[PDB]
Amino acid sequence: KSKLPKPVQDLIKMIFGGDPIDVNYEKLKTDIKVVDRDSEEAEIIRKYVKNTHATTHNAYDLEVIDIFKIEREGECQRYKPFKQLHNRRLLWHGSRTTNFAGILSQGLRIAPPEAPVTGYMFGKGIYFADMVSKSANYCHTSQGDPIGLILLGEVALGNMYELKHASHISKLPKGKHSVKGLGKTTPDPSANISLDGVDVPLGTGISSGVNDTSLLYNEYIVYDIAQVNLKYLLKLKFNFK
Ligand SMILES: COC(=O)c1cnc(N2CCN(C(=O)c3ccc(-c4nc5cccc(C(N)=O)c5[nH]4)cc3)CC2)nc1
Ligand SMILES: OC[C@H]1O[C@@](CO)(O[C@H]2O[C@H](CO)[C@@H](O)[C@H](O)[C@H]2O)[C@@H](O)[C@@H]1O
């Protein structure tokens, strides 16, 4: 007899793959609410998904199954220093389903100091995209179980260190709060809207006019866990072609 709505129950079953559903819910230390399918929030999120699928990520199309509003215990209190920092953006973060119990209970985390920098294009930090398909690739979704989880997070970017090439270090110059990896393609900035004082870059991909960058698409990195406030969790269907 769980009192949770069916979509939340199915999300819990997916994350934990056991204890009663309500016992597993309490382990996430996260308020989870279903966003109404006919709400303005849902419409904005579906537009963000539709508009920001990269043309080079054509292995699958995405369909939104369920949208959840999430509030991790203590996370808004932790974010207070960054809350009116200029340049807050609603950005994607994808991950394996098997990581989501950890992400909801502990939040997005940075690799420990001992960890090697190998493969971290912009060093040990928390990585986000403005193109849903770039983040969806980090779900590692299989044809055999074509359902993935992706976050939308409010990221306090402040003053961005704009880079066109990999730098494997995690230390920013004084007064810089984030790295923007400059892609060849960017959501049309003339379609950017604000949702609760946060920029949502849900424009269709156009050419950035940046030349001599190694990135097809933007990415955004912060180096302090307190610069992230997770807002939504989407369950997506991957329709492979
Ligand atoms: C064996 O040595 C190697 O050759 C080697 C090579 N690579 C490695 N490693 C590869 C990099 N390592 C990471 O954990 C790591 C994982 C994910 C990203 C990442 N980038 C994103 C950009 C936009 C959005 C998202 C998103 N999730 O929405 C992004 N996520 C970045 C880094 C560490 C492990 N380790 C070792
Ligand atoms: O501020 C949060 C976070 O940003 C870093 C850079 O990753 O430092 C920036 O912000 C500091 C406090 O506002 C400034 O003192 C600093 O100049 C600036 O680079 C991290 O050190 C910090 O945890």
Side-chain angles (χ1 to χ4, degrees), residues 1-82 84-241:
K1 288 126 295 198
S2 164
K3 200 95 76 164
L4 293 171
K6 218 155 309 207
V8 178
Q9 298 192 44
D10 294 335
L11 176 70
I12 295 328
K13 290 168 49 162
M14 190 179 167
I15 289 170
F16 287 95
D19 283 314
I21 281 172
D22 290 347
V23 168
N24 283 337
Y25 178 78
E26 197 250 58
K27 294 177 181 155
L28 301 173
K29 313 271 189 189
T30 300
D31 183 73
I32 308 185
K33 282 163 155 67
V34 182
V35 175
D36 278 9
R37 335 197 88 263
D38 53 0
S39 69
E40 171 130 15
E41 275 175 310
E43 193 67 17
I44 291 171
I45 292 168
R46 283 194 301 264
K47 186 182 311 290
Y48 197 3
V49 173
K50 176 187 174 165
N51 285 357
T52 72
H53 201 109
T55 59
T56 68
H57 299 152
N58 31 36
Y60 57 85
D61 273 328
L62 295 174
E63 161 174 44
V64 177
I65 302 174
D66 295 309
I67 305 171
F68 302 97
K69 189 73 198 45
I70 58 171
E71 290 171 26
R72 288 187 61 254
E73 269 196 342
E75 198 181 68
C76 177
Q77 161 74 23
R78 188 175 78 176
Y79 189 74
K80 271 167 178 195
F82 296 103
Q84 244 288 226
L85 226 106
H86 69 278
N87 189 23
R88 300 175 292 131
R89 223 112 136 190
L90 196 71
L91 295 178
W92 299 109
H93 183 92
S95 199
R96 291 172 187 279
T97 300
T98 53
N99 288 334
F100 266 88
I103 290 160
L104 298 180
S105 57
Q106 305 296 321
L108 292 177
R109 279 190 292 172
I110 296 166
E114 321 83 66
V117 295
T118 316
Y120 287 97
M121 203 184 182
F122 294 107
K124 292 178 291 174
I126 307 163
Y127 288 66
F128 299 86
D130 55 25
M131 303 286 291
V132 70
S133 57
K134 175 162 178 169
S135 285
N137 289 341
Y138 289 92
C139 298
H140 298 277
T141 303
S142 70
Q143 300 207 327
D145 184 26
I147 315 288
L149 296 177
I150 304 192
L151 290 156
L152 278 170
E154 175 182 342
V155 188
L157 293 172
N159 298 321
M160 304 188 290
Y161 197 37
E162 296 194 334
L163 297 181
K164 300 175 179 191
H165 301 296
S167 181
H168 305 288
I169 70 168
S170 324
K171 302 298 196 295
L172 283 173
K174 218 303 290 299
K176 294 300 177 158
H177 303 98
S178 63
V179 165
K180 187 185 179 186
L182 297 175
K184 284 193 168 52
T185 296
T186 197
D188 187 356
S190 80
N192 281 10
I193 63 146
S194 290
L195 177 58
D196 309 318
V198 179
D199 297 312
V200 187
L202 51 55
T204 47
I206 66 175
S207 177
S208 76
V210 175
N211 37 10
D212 200 344
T213 175
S214 49
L215 288 176
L216 293 186
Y217 312 105
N218 296 325
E219 57 188 70
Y220 303 84
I221 307 93
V222 298
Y223 303 95
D224 179 345
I225 66 189
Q227 280 177 260
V228 183
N229 195 13
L230 299 180
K231 299 293 288 194
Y232 303 97
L233 180 51
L234 285 67
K235 186 203 276 194
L236 304 167
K237 177 48 154 19
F238 291 59
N239 298 301
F240 291 92
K241 311 180 172 159

